Design a protein around this nucleic acid. Structure first.
Lengths: 53, 70, 129, 67, 56, 185, 152, 132
RNA sequence: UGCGAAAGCAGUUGAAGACAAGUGCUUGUCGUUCGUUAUAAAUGGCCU
């Protein structure tokens, strides 16, 4: 897991996390949490089996 | 006369009316009338008799590329 | 079915194209290496082009186009260019030659040579008997 | 008269044969009505078929060359 | 079924309700009757081709 | 310009590519400056096999111009897409759509192409390797596509729902490019 | 690896996004989804295929408007499995109508091949007998309905 | 049966109105109708005439007891379908339409007839039972 | 195309201009017009 702050728009904050799974999560930054899932590699799915590293 | 896919007959007593995928050939190579394309391909052509003409013609799994049909 | 371009000095992959659906049995290039033509079991001939100036500066190849001309596998392919000639000749299990133009491969006409062209006759006929 | 657009005339007959009932019908006529209907059934099947009808190299060959 | 209707026709007539109690007959018979026009259409088509190659 | 058949504006809003009957010719013009001014007949782009075939092949239904002006995408009713490099008028064929392509739009960088048609499937063509990704089973055929954001965060699509022939039923869809989920329908 | 058991009973926010596992799709369904029309017909006519499941792929192709398309690239060798099933399915009331459509097309599409192939001919002779048998049954049911109407 | 075949052929060449009379001749049977169609109807014009005569006859009286004219139509369509639809005459299509209309009626007729016949079978059987 | 039931009952599918191809003539086309109610076919198939 790791924080991420866009270099240009400092107001932007985000948290990326991954595991032994074929998808990645991103959390934008208090009733709810805005969570988006990256699960598309655009044709290179064979080369990538897990987003763990 | 006959080639791979054509047959022709020319009478030599009569004069004729005057009326991309190969080398352009700018360089040198070194240093009464009948025509039919109906019979092809032809392995060999000859006359058996004066009024008999003999034509000899030719009579694997492949990767499938379907053709769409609706 | 992949065509991969490797940097020779460092021995690394620059680009990978998943173009064919089966084996790529032969490759050939034009004189200036502006075109790389591939062929194989899927009966297709893929043209990869790097003619554009921006492509040359960035050294990036492109899967420009493809064509289906053969009825079966393509085992042997060759390319020849001269001031008066431009040929991309291919052949395979279909037992026939196919000729194209390298410069105008995408849109240029093609010729399918006869399977048997009898310069030396293998059959004779005897008029008598 | 029958044994002697028509469907509305036939289908009216079926209504008669219902209203007459089982008991009132007498055998002698019933035979004649049978032969006529059996003929009509055959014709109907015959016409129906017609309606569906309307809706619906050798190794060695000898030829003469034209010259 | 044919003999049941013929013999007991008088009693069957004098029944308060038949559709509720004979519903299975009407359902089964209706399904088979409905097929008649289509099956005839195939019969004409089959008879056509069967005649054609037989004469040829 | 006279007798404009088809016209499109770049995503940035600074290049205009339009076609005229002066059969027909394509011209691209920069709007706020004189840097870009190119013109050429459609015959040059068109393939000869297209010339031999029925008129559907020579009929352009969608047009897109890259922000830099180097690339121009032409659709055809036959379902073929042709990317033409303005610098040398070199042609590139991308053929997946079986029916007329109705919407084409370039990404801001120019590396990705959004295409949509009667297939009810929006295709992201990756031009580097000519690969593609799909979003199928949209509610209707895609009249239009666009990449809307400083970073292309959102895709704006126009859908038609052609089932209803009595009236034209437009549906505007804003998809989050992250996971391709409908942010606003 | 001790964290798998935990179910977030103490955590502030619980987020659940995994899609439920759907049952595996059969061979014929995959072919239709991938637009393999000719193969979908083949998967229908295989040993040990449930009759109901066989009826759907036939109806499904017809619904898709792909009946002739499924029957172009075929000869007598790969046409007989269909005729064998049609020889049996014509009896059933449910599949009688679907058998009617498909047999009509194959005749309209392979009349010429029928003449030169003997085996196909015997199939249609037997098929003609069975459909003729059905006509008698379907007719008879109408006669029963006629009498049953008289009683009421 | 040779004489009627040649007679019918002559009338076709002569454009006679007795072509119908030749057709309903009782000498015809099933195989000879087949052989005449296969061997003697070689011209498109003759095919049109025989179809036109037959269809008008059946259209006027589709319920005639004589099975001969329908028998001609059945084999004419079965054997010469390719040559028939090759006909592009507008009147032929209208004539085909008129024939189709008459036959379409009869198809609708059969469900009622079977219902009546089945009804009548029951009435007959009960009378037999009462006799016994 | 009109009417009607779903079956069907009546009725249409013309003229001009321009372009291309082949040889002034022939054919095919129309992001051209007027009037009447009035086959297809660029190897091209749906994600995680």
């Amino acid at each position: 897991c790791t924080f991420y702050t866009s270099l240009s728009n400092q107001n932007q904050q985000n948290i990326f996390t991954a595991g032994r799974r074929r998808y990645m999560h991103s959390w934008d930054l208090s009733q709810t949490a805005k969570i988006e899932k990256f699960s598309r590699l655009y044709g290179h799915e064979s080369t990538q089996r897990s987003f763990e590293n | 006369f006959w080639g791979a896919t054509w047959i022709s007959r020319i009478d030599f007593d009569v004069d004729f009316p005057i009326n991309g995928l190969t080398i352009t050939d700018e360089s040198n190579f070194m240093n009464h009338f009948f025509f039919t394309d109906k019979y092809k391909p032809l392995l060999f052509v000859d006359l058996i008799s004066s009024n008999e003409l003999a034509i000899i013609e030719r009579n694997q799994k492949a990767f499938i590329q379907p053709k769409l049909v609706f | 079915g992949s065509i991969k371009f490797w940097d020779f000095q460092f021995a690394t992959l620059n680009q990978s194209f998943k173009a064919h659906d089966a084996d790529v049995l032969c490759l050939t290039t034009d004189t200036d290496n502006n075109y790389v033509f591939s062929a194989g079991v899927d009966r297709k001939i893929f043209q990869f082009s790097q003619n554009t100036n921006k492509s040359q500066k960035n050294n990036r190849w492109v899967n420009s186009s493809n064509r289906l001309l053969h009825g079966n596998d393509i085992r042997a392919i060759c390319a020849y260019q001269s001031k008066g000639a431009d040929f991309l000749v291919s052949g395979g299990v279909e037992k026939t030659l196919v000729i194209n133009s390298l410069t105008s491969f995408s849109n240029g006409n093609y010729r399918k040579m006869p399977t048997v062209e009898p310069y030396s006759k293998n059959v004779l006929v005897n008029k008598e008997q | 008269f029958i044994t002697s657009q028509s469907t509305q005339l036939f289908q009216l007959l079926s209504l008669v044969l219902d209203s007459i009932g089982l008991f009132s019908l007498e055998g002698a006529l019933l035979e004649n009505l049978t032969l006529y209907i059996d003929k009509q059934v055959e014709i109907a099947e015959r016409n129906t078929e017609l309606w569906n009808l309307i809706d619906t190299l050798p190794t060695y060959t000898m030829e003469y060359l034209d010259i | 079924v044919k003999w049941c209707l013929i013999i007991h026709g008088g009693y069957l007539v004098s029944i308060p309700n038949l559709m509720s109690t004979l519903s299975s007959l009407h359902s089964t018979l209706k399904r088979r009757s409905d097929l008649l026009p289509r099956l005839l259409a195939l019969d004409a088509r089959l008879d056509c081709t069967i005649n054609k190659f037989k004469t040829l | 310009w006279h007798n404009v058949i088809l016209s499109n504006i770049s995503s940035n809003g600074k290049l205009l590519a339009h076609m005229c009957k002066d059969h027909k010719s394509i011209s691209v013009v920069s709007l706020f400056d004189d840097s870009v001014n190119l013109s050429f007949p459609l015959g040059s782009i068109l393939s000869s096999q297209t010339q031999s075939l029925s008129y559907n092949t020579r009929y352009v239904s969608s047009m897109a111009i890259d922000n830099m002006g180097q690339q121009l995408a032409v659709g055809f009713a036959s379902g073929v897409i042709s990317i033409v490099s303005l610098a040398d008028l070199q042609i590139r064929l991308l053929k997946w759509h079986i029916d007329s392509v109705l919407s084409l739009s370039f990404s801001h960088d120019g590396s990705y192409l959004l295409s949509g048609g009667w297939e009810k499937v929006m295709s992201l063509w990756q031009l580097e390797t000519n690969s593609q990704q799909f979003l199928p089973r949209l509610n209707g055929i895609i009249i239009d596509c666009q990449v809307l954001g400083p970073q292309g965060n959102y895709y704006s699509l126009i859908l038609q729902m052609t089932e209803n022939n009595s009236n034209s039923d437009y549906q505007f869809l804003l998809l989050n490019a992250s996971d391709l989920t409908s942010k606003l329908s | 690896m001790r964290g798998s058991e935990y179910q977030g009973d103490q955590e502030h926010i619980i987020h659940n996004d995994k899609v439920r596992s759907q049952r595996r799709m059969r061979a014929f369904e995959r072919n239709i989804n991938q637009f393999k029309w000719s193969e979908a017909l083949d998967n229908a006519f295989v040993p040990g295929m449930a009759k109901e499941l066989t009826l759907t792929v036939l109806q499904e192709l017809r619904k898709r408007g792909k009946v002739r398309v499924a029957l172009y690239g075929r000869d007598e060798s790969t046409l007989e499995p269909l005729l064998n099933w049609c020889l049996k399915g014509i009896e059933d009331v449910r599949s009688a109508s679907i058998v009617a459509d498909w047999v009509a097309v194959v005749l309209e599409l392979y009349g010429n091949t029928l003449e030169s192939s003997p085996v196909l001919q015997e199939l249609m002779i037997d098929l003609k007998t069975k459909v003729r048998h059905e006509i008698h049954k379907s007719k008879e049911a109408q006669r029963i309905e006629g009498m049953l109407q008289l009683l009421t | 049966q040779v004489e009627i075949a040649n007679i019918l052929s002559s009338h076709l060449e002569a454009n006679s109105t007795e072509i119908l009379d030749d057709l309903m001749s009782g000498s015809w049977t099933e195989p000879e109708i087949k052989k005449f169609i296969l061997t003697k109807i070689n011209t498109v014009d003759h095919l049109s005439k025989i179809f036109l005569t037959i269809s008008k006859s059946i259209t006027q009286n589709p319920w005639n007891e004589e099975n001969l004219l329908p028998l001609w139509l059945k084999w004419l369509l079965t054997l010469k379908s390719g040559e028939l639809n090759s006909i592009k005459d507008k009147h032929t299509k209208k004539n085909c339409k008129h024939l189709k209309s008459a036959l379409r009626s009869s198809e609708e007729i059969l469900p009622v007839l079977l219902g009546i016949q089945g009804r009548l079978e029951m009435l007959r059987r009960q009378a037999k039972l009462r006799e016994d």
